[PDB]
Write an enzyme that holds these catalytic residues in place. Sequence first.
Site, PDB file in Angstrom:
ATOM      1  N   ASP A 186       0.868  -1.183   0.000  1.00  0.00           N
ATOM      2  CA  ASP A 186       0.000   0.000   0.000  1.00  0.00           C
ATOM      3  C   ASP A 186       0.904   1.232   0.000  1.00  0.00           C
ATOM      4  O   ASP A 186       2.123   1.088   0.139  1.00  0.00           O
ATOM      5  CB  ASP A 186      -0.975  -0.063   1.161  1.00  0.00           C
ATOM      6  CG  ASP A 186      -2.162   0.867   1.126  1.00  0.00           C
ATOM      7  OD1 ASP A 186      -2.952   0.859   2.103  1.00  0.00           O
ATOM      8  OD2 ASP A 186      -2.336   1.615   0.161  1.00  0.00           O
ATOM      9  N   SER A 187       0.337   2.423  -0.158  1.00  0.00           N
ATOM     10  CA  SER A 187       1.125   3.642  -0.334  1.00  0.00           C
ATOM     11  C   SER A 187       1.474   4.392   0.944  1.00  0.00           C
ATOM     12  O   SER A 187       2.261   5.354   0.899  1.00  0.00           O
ATOM     13  CB  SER A 187       0.359   4.566  -1.287  1.00  0.00           C
ATOM     14  OG  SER A 187      -0.991   4.675  -0.886  1.00  0.00           O
ATOM     15  N   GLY A 188       0.921   3.979   2.086  1.00  0.00           N
ATOM     16  CA  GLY A 188       1.311   4.490   3.367  1.00  0.00           C
ATOM     17  C   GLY A 188       0.419   5.486   4.060  1.00  0.00           C
ATOM     18  O   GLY A 188       0.391   5.548   5.304  1.00  0.00           O
ATOM     19  N   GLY A 189      -0.337   6.311   3.349  1.00  0.00           N
ATOM     20  CA  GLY A 189      -1.175   7.301   3.997  1.00  0.00           C
ATOM     21  C   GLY A 189      -2.331   6.749   4.808  1.00  0.00           C
ATOM     22  O   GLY A 189      -2.611   7.346   5.862  1.00  0.00           O
ATOM     23  N   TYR A 190      -2.980   5.668   4.367  1.00  0.00           N
ATOM     24  CA  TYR A 190      -4.042   5.026   5.136  1.00  0.00           C
ATOM     25  C   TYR A 190      -3.553   4.807   6.568  1.00  0.00           C
ATOM     26  O   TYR A 190      -4.192   5.210   7.541  1.00  0.00           O
ATOM     27  CB  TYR A 190      -4.548   3.693   4.540  1.00  0.00           C
ATOM     28  CG  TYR A 190      -5.538   2.998   5.451  1.00  0.00           C
ATOM     29  CD1 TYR A 190      -5.177   1.974   6.320  1.00  0.00           C
ATOM     30  CD2 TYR A 190      -6.868   3.389   5.457  1.00  0.00           C
ATOM     31  CE1 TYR A 190      -6.090   1.358   7.155  1.00  0.00           C
ATOM     32  CE2 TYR A 190      -7.801   2.780   6.289  1.00  0.00           C
ATOM     33  CZ  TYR A 190      -7.404   1.768   7.131  1.00  0.00           C
ATOM     34  OH  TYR A 190      -8.317   1.160   7.956  1.00  0.00           O
ATOM     35  N   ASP A 228      -2.737   8.122  -1.998  1.00  0.00           N
ATOM     36  CA  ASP A 228      -4.051   8.691  -1.854  1.00  0.00           C
ATOM     37  C   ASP A 228      -4.325   9.255  -0.456  1.00  0.00           C
ATOM     38  O   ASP A 228      -3.522   9.066   0.461  1.00  0.00           O
ATOM     39  CB  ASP A 228      -5.123   7.639  -2.194  1.00  0.00           C
ATOM     40  CG  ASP A 228      -5.207   6.456  -1.257  1.00  0.00           C
ATOM     41  OD1 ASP A 228      -4.162   6.066  -0.683  1.00  0.00           O
ATOM     42  OD2 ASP A 228      -6.305   5.877  -1.060  1.00  0.00           O
ATOM     43  N   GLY A 230     -11.458   4.056   0.391  1.00  0.00           N
ATOM     44  CA  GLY A 230     -12.383   4.687   1.287  1.00  0.00           C
ATOM     45  C   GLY A 230     -13.557   3.868   1.749  1.00  0.00           C
ATOM     46  O   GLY A 230     -14.565   4.453   2.185  1.00  0.00           O
ATOM     47  N   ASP A 272      -7.527  -7.640   0.512  1.00  0.00           N
ATOM     48  CA  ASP A 272      -6.578  -7.813   1.600  1.00  0.00           C
ATOM     49  C   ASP A 272      -7.274  -7.535   2.929  1.00  0.00           C
ATOM     50  O   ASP A 272      -8.147  -6.663   2.988  1.00  0.00           O
ATOM     51  CB  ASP A 272      -5.367  -6.885   1.485  1.00  0.00           C
ATOM     52  CG  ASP A 272      -5.629  -5.478   1.990  1.00  0.00           C
ATOM     53  OD1 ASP A 272      -6.227  -4.653   1.262  1.00  0.00           O
ATOM     54  OD2 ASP A 272      -5.236  -5.139   3.136  1.00  0.00           O
ATOM     55  N   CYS A 286     -11.952 -28.496   6.353  1.00  0.00           N
ATOM     56  CA  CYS A 286     -10.727 -27.791   5.988  1.00  0.00           C
ATOM     57  C   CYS A 286      -9.599 -28.766   5.699  1.00  0.00           C
ATOM     58  O   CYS A 286      -9.433 -29.758   6.413  1.00  0.00           O
ATOM     59  CB  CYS A 286     -10.359 -26.809   7.099  1.00  0.00           C
ATOM     60  SG  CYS A 286      -8.839 -25.884   6.808  1.00  0.00           S
ATOM     61  N   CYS A 345      -6.439 -27.794   5.504  1.00  0.00           N
ATOM     62  CA  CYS A 345      -5.137 -27.318   5.986  1.00  0.00           C
ATOM     63  C   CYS A 345      -4.462 -28.304   6.931  1.00  0.00           C
ATOM     64  O   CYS A 345      -5.021 -29.185   7.579  1.00  0.00           O
ATOM     65  CB  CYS A 345      -5.303 -25.938   6.621  1.00  0.00           C
ATOM     66  SG  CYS A 345      -5.576 -25.867   8.404  1.00  0.00           S
ATOM     67  N   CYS A 364      -5.673 -28.623  10.438  1.00  0.00           N
ATOM     68  CA  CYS A 364      -6.885 -29.418  10.662  1.00  0.00           C
ATOM     69  C   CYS A 364      -6.612 -30.890  10.403  1.00  0.00           C
ATOM     70  O   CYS A 364      -7.386 -31.718  10.871  1.00  0.00           O
ATOM     71  CB  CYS A 364      -8.037 -28.915   9.806  1.00  0.00           C
ATOM     72  SG  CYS A 364      -8.676 -27.329  10.394  1.00  0.00           S
ATOM     73  N   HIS A 382      -4.328 -21.896   9.820  1.00  0.00           N
ATOM     74  CA  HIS A 382      -5.688 -22.328   9.519  1.00  0.00           C
ATOM     75  C   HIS A 382      -6.497 -21.202   8.873  1.00  0.00           C
ATOM     76  O   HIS A 382      -7.130 -21.404   7.841  1.00  0.00           O
ATOM     77  CB  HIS A 382      -6.421 -22.794  10.783  1.00  0.00           C
ATOM     78  CG  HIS A 382      -7.902 -22.855  10.527  1.00  0.00           C
ATOM     79  ND1 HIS A 382      -8.411 -23.887   9.781  1.00  0.00           N
ATOM     80  CD2 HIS A 382      -8.949 -22.065  10.871  1.00  0.00           C
ATOM     81  CE1 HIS A 382      -9.724 -23.737   9.683  1.00  0.00           C
ATOM     82  NE2 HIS A 382     -10.081 -22.628  10.334  1.00  0.00           N
TER      83      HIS A 382
HETATM   84  C1  LIG Z   1      -9.713  -2.098   6.859  1.00  0.00           C
HETATM   85  N1  LIG Z   1     -10.270  -1.081   5.985  1.00  0.00           N
HETATM   86  C2  LIG Z   1      -9.599  -0.438   5.012  1.00  0.00           C
HETATM   87  N2  LIG Z   1      -8.364  -0.569   4.734  1.00  0.00           N
HETATM   88  C3  LIG Z   1      -8.000   0.305   3.771  1.00  0.00           C
HETATM   89  C4  LIG Z   1      -6.746   0.547   3.195  1.00  0.00           C
HETATM   90  C5  LIG Z   1      -5.551  -0.304   3.617  1.00  0.00           C
HETATM   91  C6  LIG Z   1      -5.657  -1.740   3.006  1.00  0.00           C
HETATM   92  N3  LIG Z   1      -4.850  -2.672   3.881  1.00  0.00           N
HETATM   93  C7  LIG Z   1      -3.394  -2.458   3.617  1.00  0.00           C
HETATM   94  C8  LIG Z   1      -2.494  -3.179   4.663  1.00  0.00           C
HETATM   95  C9  LIG Z   1      -2.987  -2.827   6.098  1.00  0.00           C
HETATM   96  C10 LIG Z   1      -2.151  -3.653   7.121  1.00  0.00           C
HETATM   97  C11 LIG Z   1      -0.648  -3.299   6.985  1.00  0.00           C
HETATM   98  C12 LIG Z   1      -0.134  -3.536   5.542  1.00  0.00           C
HETATM   99  C13 LIG Z   1      -1.000  -2.720   4.536  1.00  0.00           C
HETATM  100  C14 LIG Z   1      -6.702   1.658   2.329  1.00  0.00           C
HETATM  101  N4  LIG Z   1      -5.543   2.037   1.740  1.00  0.00           N
HETATM  102  C15 LIG Z   1      -5.405   3.060   0.977  1.00  0.00           C
HETATM  103  N5  LIG Z   1      -4.217   3.496   0.482  1.00  0.00           N
HETATM  104  N6  LIG Z   1      -6.481   3.786   0.588  1.00  0.00           N
HETATM  105  C16 LIG Z   1      -7.702   3.542   1.082  1.00  0.00           C
HETATM  106  O1  LIG Z   1      -8.702   4.162   0.795  1.00  0.00           O
HETATM  107  C17 LIG Z   1      -7.878   2.352   2.003  1.00  0.00           C
HETATM  108  C18 LIG Z   1      -9.138   2.092   2.572  1.00  0.00           C
HETATM  109  C19 LIG Z   1      -9.119   1.051   3.514  1.00  0.00           C
HETATM  110  N7  LIG Z   1     -10.186   0.545   4.275  1.00  0.00           N
HETATM  111 ZN   LIG Z   2      -7.799 -25.818   8.834  1.00  0.00          ZN
END
Ligand SMILES: CNc1nc2c(CCNCC3CCCCC3)c3nc(N)[nH]c(=O)c3cc2[nH]1
Ligand SMILES: [Zn+2]
EC number: 2.4.2.29
Lengths: 356, 356
Positions: A92-96, A134, A208, A258, A291, A293, A296, A322
Amino acid sequence: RPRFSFSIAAREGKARTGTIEMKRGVIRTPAFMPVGTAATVKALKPETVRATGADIILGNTYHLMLRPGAERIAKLGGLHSFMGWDRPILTDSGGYQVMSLKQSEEGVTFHMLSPERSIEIQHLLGSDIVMAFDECTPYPATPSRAASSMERSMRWAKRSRDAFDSRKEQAENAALFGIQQGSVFENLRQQSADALAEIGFDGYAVGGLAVGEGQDEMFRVLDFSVPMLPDDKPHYLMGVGKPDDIVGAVERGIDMFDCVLPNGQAFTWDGPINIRNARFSEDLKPLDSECHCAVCQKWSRAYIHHLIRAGEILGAMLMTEHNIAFYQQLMQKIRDSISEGRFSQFAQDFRARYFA
Amino acid sequence: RPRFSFSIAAREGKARTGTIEMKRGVIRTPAFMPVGTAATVKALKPETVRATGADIILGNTYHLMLRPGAERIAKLGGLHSFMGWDRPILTDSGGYQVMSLKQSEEGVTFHMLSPERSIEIQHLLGSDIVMAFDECTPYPATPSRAASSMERSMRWAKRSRDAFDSRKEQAENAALFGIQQGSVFENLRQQSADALAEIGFDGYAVGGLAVGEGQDEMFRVLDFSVPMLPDDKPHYLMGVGKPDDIVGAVERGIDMFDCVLPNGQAFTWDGPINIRNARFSEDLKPLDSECHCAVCQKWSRAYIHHLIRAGEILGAMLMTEHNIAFYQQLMQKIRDSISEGRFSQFAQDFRARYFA
Ligand SMILES: CNc1nc2c(CCNCC3CCCCC3)c3nc(N)[nH]c(=O)c3cc2[nH]1
Ligand SMILES: [Zn+2]
Ligand SMILES: CNc1nc2c(CCNCC3CCCCC3)c3nc(N)[nH]c(=O)c3cc2[nH]1
Ligand SMILES: [Zn+2]
């Protein structure tokens, strides 16, 4: 293999199953992408991650830029070499995660992240699938605020694209995904979708969502939002999610997932269970009856209940293997049912049993 | 296989290498026996324990009688089935850990343990090698106190023996070891050795060491104590220990070892290292240059340094696998050097390098 090729093998309604071909491997879609903590998928060796059926994992840009440092990982040969996973990695890009834990048009300091730096960090890590930088708009959001945020993100998306393209090795070997924003507003989603298609990306994420709005509202927004994206590219729903969320989202055109979701919660085809519960202390059955796995195959509910209650590391190991395997089995059943044109029946069957 | 058969294949000075044959498998001697926490060897699947070369592990009687309960484990099929290890298991008798955390000739309440209950608990767990219920005498100890404690232990040893023999299935399928006491006093050690041989056991442990006296004093007591035991049965030094301790103890006639020793301490043939140290942040070498373990095949010092600093479970997993494999490699080199009549040279070589 090519740098990036998405092909759709079969469809059913809005659902699709296919493959993403990349230099480091093939990704079967709809895909579940297990998430890393700090250059590791919690409590699992990479071989084990792969054994559960994962084709791709997520790198944790926010943690890694902080520790160990993107520059240090690059010096050390990249994330793939570092953690010992040789298959595709999405970052991911980091801002979340930043906002999740000083904002301006240039980016965010917290210590600093902008479209350019984000793309560079993901390059230093050696990510295969790079997300645009973003702004994930808080929920709920007024239309003014959502529009303002969306607009910034689209500007940031253009900057991400140029940054990526500016770096020959990145552009030739990695893929870039744009992220749609717009909160729950259709016109904003449409404006965002249009902005992103105009820039052009290898894939399109729906950003979002999964930020407090609830499944009904998430499905409602997906209903109009996913068709706005280019049909011929992958659609990634960021941060989702529980099994039932995944099924509904695939019904609405999502190809990639994810979540940190897959503590004592174990997924089963009869719904989740909390293995800490006293009712499992002497239950000799495996976590789930069907399952496939390794957990299990070999250990009981009673044993894993003991391990988790006792705070033992093996308990985390077993529960994590699991649950990630359960998710991969879910995806496999989804892929097979769409290929065979019986995905709507699978979904109905799944829900009837999971929620019985 | 027989219930129990110890055979000595080769000797060098007081050192011996051989095999213990038991119904659930063969134990190569001198042996290192990895220790469990709570029906698990910390952060390792049993397959992984076995892959490092372990022939036998130790069950944790004290923890298991408390959680999950010996009776519950028996109901569930025994420790072997429960944790998924089908090879021999040794169980200590519980008092060491009790005093380590109301004493009388009957036993100890803390909630209750006596020779009879201890033997019964070890039976409920399904232990292959059952330790007599003893008193581990504190160090330092006055001769009066050491003698008093030793005497109680020998009475307790007779009671352990009768209890064990009283239970047909235990007696026919498991082995019983007596434990020598006497602190650091030769006459007491001799009295204890004589008492135990008179009762008769399948094996003889040297108890009450590794409790603060230091290596010089431990070796001094081993010098006269191990020859007091029957030559033709195994000799087990309880709670030892560091690599150098093991080598010296094998030179003095010890055949079996357990320790919780194999945090960021990694064993290497050039001595231990603490992988948390900043000097390893960018070190791409494996933990040890020669180690054949899977960890050293695949991951760097830099990676494991990151994992441990970050508090990641995979770091514990990897460090534990390496260290238990290092110990097994040590034992294997010991066994081979004695078989080949070059163990004194191996010891000198080992020490020169480990302490360089
Ligand atoms: C759980 N809900 C949610 N997640 C979003 C995420 C993160 C997705 N998960 C990435 C991993 C998180 C654990 C660490 C490694 C990266 C979002 N990411 C971005 N950049 N933009 C979103 O709108 C965006 C929107 C999100 N909504
Ligand atoms: Zn299992
Ligand atoms: C570390 N030093 C040391 N240990 C001794 C031990 C314990 C050996 N380790 C057993 C495991 C410990 C971890 C949990 C599972 C059981 C001793 N045990 C007994 N019964 N008698 C001793 O004199 C005796 C003496 C000991 N000296
Ligand atoms: Zn190693």
